[PDB]
Amino acid sequence: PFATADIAEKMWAENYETTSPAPVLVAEGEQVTIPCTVMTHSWPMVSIRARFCRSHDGSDELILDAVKGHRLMNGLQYRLPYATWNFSQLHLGQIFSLTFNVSTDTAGMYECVLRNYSHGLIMQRFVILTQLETLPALGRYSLGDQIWSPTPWRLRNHDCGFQRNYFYIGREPDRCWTVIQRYRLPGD
Amino acid sequence: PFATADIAEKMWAENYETTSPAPVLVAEGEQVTIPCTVMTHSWPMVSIRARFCRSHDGSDELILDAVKGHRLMNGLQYRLPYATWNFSQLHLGQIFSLTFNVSTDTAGMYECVLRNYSHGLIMQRFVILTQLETLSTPALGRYSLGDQIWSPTPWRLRNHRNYFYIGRAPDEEPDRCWTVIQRYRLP
Amino acid sequence: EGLCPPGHHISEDGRDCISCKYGQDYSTHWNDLLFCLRCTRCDSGEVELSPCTTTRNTVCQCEEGTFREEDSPEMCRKCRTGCPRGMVKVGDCTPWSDIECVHKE
Amino acid sequence: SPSEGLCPPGHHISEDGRDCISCKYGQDYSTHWNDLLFCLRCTRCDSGEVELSPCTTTRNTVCQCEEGTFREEDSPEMCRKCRTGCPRGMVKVGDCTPWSDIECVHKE
Ligand SMILES: *[C@@H]1O[C@H](CO)[C@@H](O[C@@H]2O[C@H](CO)[C@@H](O)[C@H](O)[C@H]2NC(C)=O)[C@H](O)[C@H]1NC(C)=O
Ligand SMILES: *[C@@H]1O[C@H](CO)[C@@H](O[C@@H]2O[C@H](CO)[C@@H](O)[C@H](O)[C@H]2NC(C)=O)[C@H](O)[C@H]1NC(C)=O
Ligand SMILES: *[C@@H]1O[C@H](CO)[C@@H](O)[C@H](O)[C@H]1NC(C)=O
Ligand SMILES: [Ca+2]
Ligand SMILES: [Ca+2]
Ligand SMILES: [Ca+2]
Ligand SMILES: [Ca+2]
Ligand code: NA
C-alpha cells in the first residue's frame, strides 16, 4: 500500500542519549517547534526525521541543504501538510526547525540528523506525546528520565476514548512504546 | 576600579559536559551567534553569561525574562556594545541567542543559564577563541563530537612558540580561558 | 513544491530530472535532490517483505519471534518467552512489540 | 520613577513599574540599568577565598583564591590547590598565581 522511506545506514552521536530529553506531553492543537542546533560540519544535507506513534512505518524526513537551508525533499507533507520550517546560519553552527500543530496523528519521535545520500548521523531525539495510558506530580522539564509537560497544571485523567487510566493535557498499536517505556512518570 | 558581577550560587546541569562542544577557533570580524535552547522550565529568567579571555573578572550577563524574552538587564553592554539578541517561544521550550562580531576582546566562555536572583543553572558552554598558542600545523577540521578544537572555516588556518588563528576571508596578559582550553586537544 | 517527481533526482545543471537506479536508490516525493537516497538493505534477523523500487524503500521486517526496537539502534530484539512469577502477561510477541509484563505489587 | 522604563544601578523596579527601590547593601546589587523585580544576591566568598572588596549595591563582592591556590574556570569554578612543581625532565612554564596553576612542558 503506502510508499515508505528511511535512512539506509543510521548512526548515532556519542551524546545522543544525554542530549535527548524525556518525552513531553502536549495538548492537541498546541503549536510546537522541533529545534535543531548543529555545529558547523561537513555533511551536504540536514534533516528532521519523523516516526509517528500511529499508522506509520519507516521514517519521513524534511531534507534541507546544509549550507544554505533550502528544501530538498519534504517527506513530511502528507502527515504534516501545514508544517513550516526555518533555517539560520550562525557561522559557528546552524539552527533548523519544524513548526506544526500537535494532534494524535502528529505525536511521534522527532530527530535532528546530519545527512548524506546513504547515511544519517542522528544527533538528538524529541518525543512528542498527546496521551499516556496507565494500568502523578507532572512537572515542567527538569533533567532526567522523567516525562513532563510545558503546561502540567492542565493534566487530566480519563478512562478510555485492567485498572486503567488515560492521561492527556487538553484545551491500534503505538510505535512510540519501546522509547516511552525507557522513561518514567513522577512518583509523587 | 571596575564593577563586576556574577552568579552567586552556581549550579551545573547533569549533561553540561556532554552538551558543551569543544572550543571553536574563529576569525576576527566574523559575526557569530551563541545559540541557547531550553525545555520549558520553571525559572523566572534566563541568561547568556560571558567570561572573556582577556582583561575580565567575574561574569557579564544578558538577563532576559524566561516567559516573554524581554531584556531585564544587559550586563554585556560595555564589552559587546553592538550585540543583538533574539528569543523564540517554541511552547515545548524557548530558544534565546546572542549575536556579535568576534574580536580579541570578545573571545570567551559563553553560557546558557536558567536564572533567579541568587542561583543560576548553567546548561551549556561555548568557547569562542581567536588565537591558539603552542611550544616546540595540526589537521584542524570542522566540528565532530569530541575533545577536539575545531573551526567553521579551517581551510584558513594560519601560523604566525607558535601562534594559530583563522585568517580573514602576540601578547602577554593572562588568558582566563586557559583552564578550560587545556581540557581539550588539537588534532 | 520540488522540480523532480518521485523516482527522480535533479541534474547538475538544475534543468533535468534523472531517474533513480532500480535496486540501488529511490526518492519518495517531489524533490530537488542532486542524488537519490540509498535503499535499505535488510539485515540478518530481518525478512525482506518487499523490494526497493525507485519510488519506495525496501520493506524489512523483524523475523518471527523477534520485534522492532524503536530506541537506538533500532534493530530487532528477541521477544521474551513470558513473564516472571507475580506478573501477568499483557502484550504478545509481534514484529513491532515484545510481550508486556505487569506486576501486582 | 524609572528613566526609560529602567531603574538605575543599585536599584531594582517594583512590580507595578512605578518605583525604583534601592538594593540592600551587604545583601544584593545591580550593576546596570534594569527592569528586575529583585536585585542580584552578592557572592559570599567560600573558604579558600579572600574577600578583596565588599559587595555594594552597585558591584559584586571580589573573591580571590588564597595564595597557593588558583581559580579554575571549568565547572565548578572553585579554587584549586596549585599542583606541586614540575618533574625532573620537564620545564616549568606556568607559575602558581590566584588565576593560574603551575604549567609543565616535556622535552619530548
Ligand atoms: C556518507 O557518509 C558516510 C559516513 O560518514 C560516508 O562513509 C564513510 O566514508 C569515510 C570517508 O570516505 C570513511 O572513512 C568511512 O569508512 C565511512 N564511514 C562509515 C561509518 O561508513 C560516506 O562516504 C558518505 N557518502 C558520500 C557520498 O560521501
Ligand atoms: C532560586 O533557585 C534556587 C535553585 O532552584 C532555589 O533554591 C532551592 O530552593 C528549593 C525550594 O525552596 C530547595 O528545595 C533547595 O534547597 C534549593 N536548591 C539549592 C540548589 O540550593 C531558590 O528557592 C530559588 N529562589 C527563589 C526566590 O525562588
Ligand atoms: C559586524 O561585522 C559584520 C560582518 O561580519 C558587518 O555586517 C557589520 O558591519 C558589523 N556590525 C557591527 C554592528 O559592528
Ligand atoms: Ca501543552
Ligand atoms: Ca524519528
Ligand atoms: Ca553575585
Ligand atoms: Ca550590596
Ligand atoms: Na517554510
Residue numbers in the entry:
A (entry chain B): 32 to 166, 176 to 201, 206 to 215, 230 to 246
B (entry chain A): 32 to 167, 175 to 198, 208 to 216, 227 to 244
C (entry chain C): 78 to 182
D (entry chain D): 75 to 182
Paper excerpt:
Here, we report the structural and biochemical characterization of the novel, non-canonical interaction between UL141 and TRAIL-R2, an interaction that has evolved to inhibit cell death mediated by TRAIL signaling and mute host defenses. Remarkably, UL141 displays no structural homology to TNF superfamily ligands, and instead utilizes its Ig-domain to bind with high affinity to the TRAIL death receptor. We have shown that cells infected with an HCMVΔUL141 mutant are more susceptible to killing by TRAIL, and that UL141 is both necessary and sufficient to retain both TRAIL receptors in the ER, thus preventing their cell surface expression.
The complex of HCMV UL141 (residues 30–279) bound to human TRAIL-R2 (residues 58–184, both numberings start from the initial methionine) was crystallized and the structure determined by single anomalous dispersion (SAD), using experimental phases derived from selenomethionine labeled protein expressed in Sf9 insect cells. The crystal structure was refined to a resolution of 2.1 Å with an R factor of 22.3% and an Rfree of 27.4%. One UL141 dimer binds two TRAIL-R2 monomers through non-crystallographic two-fold symmetry resulting in a heterotetrameric complex. Structural analysis revealed that UL141 interacts in a head-to-tail fashion to form a well-packed dimer that is stabilized primarily through polar interactions, such as hydrogen bonds and salt bridges, and several hydrophobic contacts, while burying a total surface area of 1423 Å2. The UL141 ectodomain exhibits an N-terminal immunoglobulin (Ig)-like domain, followed by an additional C-terminal β-sheet domain. In contrast to TRAIL binding to TRAIL-R2, which leads to head-to-head (180°) trimerization of the receptor, UL141 binds both TRAIL-R2 monomers diagonally across the entire UL141 ectodomain, resulting in an approximate rotation of both TRAIL-R2 monomers of 90° to each other. The high affinity interaction between UL141 and TRAIL-R2 correlates well with the large solvent-accessible surface area of the heterotetrameric complex in which 2694 Å2 are buried on the UL141 dimer (1347 Å2 per monomer) and 1351 Å2 are buried on each TRAIL-R2 monomer. CRD-1–3 span a length of 70 Å, and CRD-2 and CRD-3 form the major ligand-binding region in the UL141–TRAIL-R2 complex. In summary, patch 5 involves strong hydrophobic features important for the stability of complexes throughout the TNF/TNFR superfamily, and we postulate that UL141 has evolved to mimic this interaction in order to modulate this TRAIL DR.
